């Protein structure tokens, strides 16, 4: 057990190992206060996040557990990982706070796009890395569910990490713009390829400097989507479980798929082709991350020997019906058993 020291900063108590120095507040909210700090053991600048009250309810307890499990599992260059997790508690009986430590992220991809349309070589490299990370994430049977520019961290060298996994929306709002239509309107039990739709939305925006589907509400968004990709045929309609949703779709004038070379004017033809494969309305027919990596658009970077998959991820706890204290005791074992990564 390391030695902990205790202080109040902006009216939050921080009780952390002596390895973490020069804590300064960078954040507060529903989920957690965050400080930036210097990690003397690794030499990195880090984000230390104190979870507000993680065992407040069965859903929060389970949320905390889920988040911890997920961050413990993710070990890939293009995906956020855990540097440390700790509690000042010396026993299960006094366990209440959880702190997570990750690399301090500077700029997200919004910074990068908001300024301009990018060069094609830049779009290739950035999308390459999202798909590399996504191959890994999907190989573990994990679905991100909330990919968008603010959840992608990018450095000065254009190196990228996927953050902020959706682990359990109204109006003119950025978060909904990147979501696949079947998840946006709950048409069906959805696929990992909801994430591929998101990548297509992001890629389009990188190439044009504009939001692809900036709908003013769910309906206006759908219409934007159907105008580009066409209205569902019979085959897709059959897979939509809500009768009302099917009737709503059949109320709309049918529309053909547009020519994407006349939307993405002047883009690389290989970029146009890849967008056509990602932005397919029927989620059974969308390209997978692994197939997208093999697409000619990424010939400069693709190397199937350097695109690893994840170790199997046991997600059986999601079906498990436990009490608060059982979720808490599982989370405590996960904290105590943490093994840090290599220097």
Curated annotation (Swiss-Prot):
Modified residues (Phosphotyrosine): 172, 313
UniProt note on regulation of activity: Activated by cell stresses such as DNA damage, heat shock, osmotic shock, anisomycin and sodium arsenite, as well as pro-inflammatory stimuli such as bacterial lipopolysaccharide (LPS) and interleukin-1. Activation occurs through dual phosphorylation of Thr-170 and Tyr-172 by either of two dual specificity kinases, MAP2K3/MKK3 or MAP2K6/MKK6, and potentially also MAP2K4/MKK4, as well as by TAB1-mediated autophosphorylation.
Catalyzed chemical reaction(s): L-seryl-[protein] + ATP = O-phospho-L-seryl-[protein] + ADP + H(+); L-threonyl-[protein] + ATP = O-phospho-L-threonyl-[protein] + ADP + H(+)
Localization: Cytoplasm; Nucleus
Entry's Gene Ontology molecular function annotations: ATP binding; kinase activity; MAP kinase activity; mitogen-activated protein kinase p38 binding; NFAT protein binding; protein kinase activity; protein phosphatase binding; protein serine kinase activity
Cofactors demanded by this protein: Mg(2+)
Keywords: Acetylation, Apoptosis, ATP-binding, Cytoplasm, Kinase, Nucleotide-binding, Nucleus, Phosphoprotein, Serine/threonine-protein kinase, Stress response, Transcription, Transcription regulation, Transferase, Ubl conjugation
Top-level enzyme category: transferase
Gene Ontology biological process terms, A to Z: angiogenesis; apoptotic process; bone development; cartilage condensation; cell morphogenesis; cell surface receptor protein serine/threonine kinase signaling pathway; cellular response to ionizing radiation; cellular response to lipopolysaccharide
Annotated disulfide bonds: none
GO cellular component: cytoplasm; cytosol; glutamatergic synapse; mitochondrion; nuclear speck; nucleoplasm; nucleus; spindle pole
Modification Phosphothreonine occurs at: 12, 170
Post-translational modification: Dually phosphorylated on Thr-170 and Tyr-172 by the MAP2Ks MAP2K3/MKK3, MAP2K4/MKK4 and MAP2K6/MKK6 in response to inflammatory cytokines, environmental stress or growth factors, which activates the enzyme. Dual phosphorylation can also be mediated by TAB1-mediated autophosphorylation. TCR engagement in T-cells also leads to Tyr-313 phosphorylation by ZAP70. Dephosphorylated and inactivated by DUPS1, DUSP10 and DUSP16. PPM1D also mediates dephosphorylation and inactivation of MAPK14.
Active-site residues from the entry: 164 (proton acceptor)
Protein kinase domain segment(s): 20-298
Record remark on domains: The TXY motif contains the threonine and tyrosine residues whose phosphorylation activates the MAP kinases.
UniProt record similarity statement: Belongs to the protein kinase superfamily. CMGC Ser/Thr protein kinase family. MAP kinase subfamily.
Subunit composition and interactions: Component of a signaling complex containing at least AKAP13, PKN1, MAPK14, ZAK and MAP2K3. Within this complex, AKAP13 interacts directly with PKN1, which in turn recruits MAPK14, MAP2K3 and ZAK. Binds to a kinase interaction motif within the protein tyrosine phosphatase, PTPRR. This interaction retains MAPK14 in the cytoplasm and prevents nuclear accumulation. Interacts with SPAG9 and GADD45A. Interacts with CDC25B, CDC25C, DUSP1, DUSP10, DUSP16, NP60, SUPT20H and TAB1. Interacts with casein kinase II subunits CSNK2A1 and CSNK2B. Interacts with PPM1D.
Protein known as: Mitogen-activated protein kinase 14
Chain's gene name: Mapk14
């Amino acid at each position: 057990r390391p030695t902990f020291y205790r202080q109040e900063l902006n009216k939050t108590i921080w009780e952390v190992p002596e390895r973490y120095q020069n804590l300064s507040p960078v954040g507060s909210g529903a989920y957690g206060s965050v400080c930036a700090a210097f990690d003397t053991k690794t030499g990195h600048r880090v984000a230390v996040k104190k979870l507000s009250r993680p065992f407040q309810s069965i859903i929060h307890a389970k949320r905390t557990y889920r988040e911890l499990r997920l961050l413990k599992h993710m070990k890939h260059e293009n995906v956020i990982g855990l540097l440390d997790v700790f509690t000042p508690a010396r026993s299960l009986e006094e366990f209440n706070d959880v702190y997570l430590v990750t690399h301090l992220m500077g700029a997200d991809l919004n910074n990068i796009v908001k300024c301009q349309k990018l060069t094609d070589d830049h779009v290739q490299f950035l999308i390459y890395q999202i798909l590399r990370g996504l191959k890994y994430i999907h190989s573990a049977d994990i679905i991100h569910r909330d990919l968008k520019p603010s959840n992608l961290a990018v450095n000065e060298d254009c190196e990228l990490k996927i953050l902020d996994f959706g682990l359990a929306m109204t109006g003119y709002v950025a978060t909904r713009w990147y979501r696949a239509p079947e998840i946006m309107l709950n048409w069906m039990h959805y696929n990992q390829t909801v994430d591929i739709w998101s990548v297509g939305c992001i890629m389009a925006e990188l190439l044009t400097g504009r939001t692809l589907f900036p709908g003013t509400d769910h309906i206006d968004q759908l219409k934007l989507i159907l105008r580009l990709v066409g209205t569902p045929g019979a085959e897709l309609l059959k897979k939509i479980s809500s009768e009302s949703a099917r009737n709503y779709i059949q109320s709309l004038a049918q529309m053909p798929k547009m020519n994407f070379a006349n939307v993405f004017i002047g883009a690389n033809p290989l970029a146009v082709d890849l967008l056509e494969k990602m932005l397919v309305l029927d989620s059974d027919k969308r390209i997978t991350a692994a197939q997208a990596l093999a697409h000619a658009y990424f010939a400069q970077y693709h190397d199937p020997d350097d695109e690893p998959v994840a170790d199997p991820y046991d997600q059986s706890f999601e079906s498990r019906d436990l009490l608060i204290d059982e979720w808490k005791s599982l989370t405590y074992d996960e904290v105590i058993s943490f093994v840090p990564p290599p220097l």
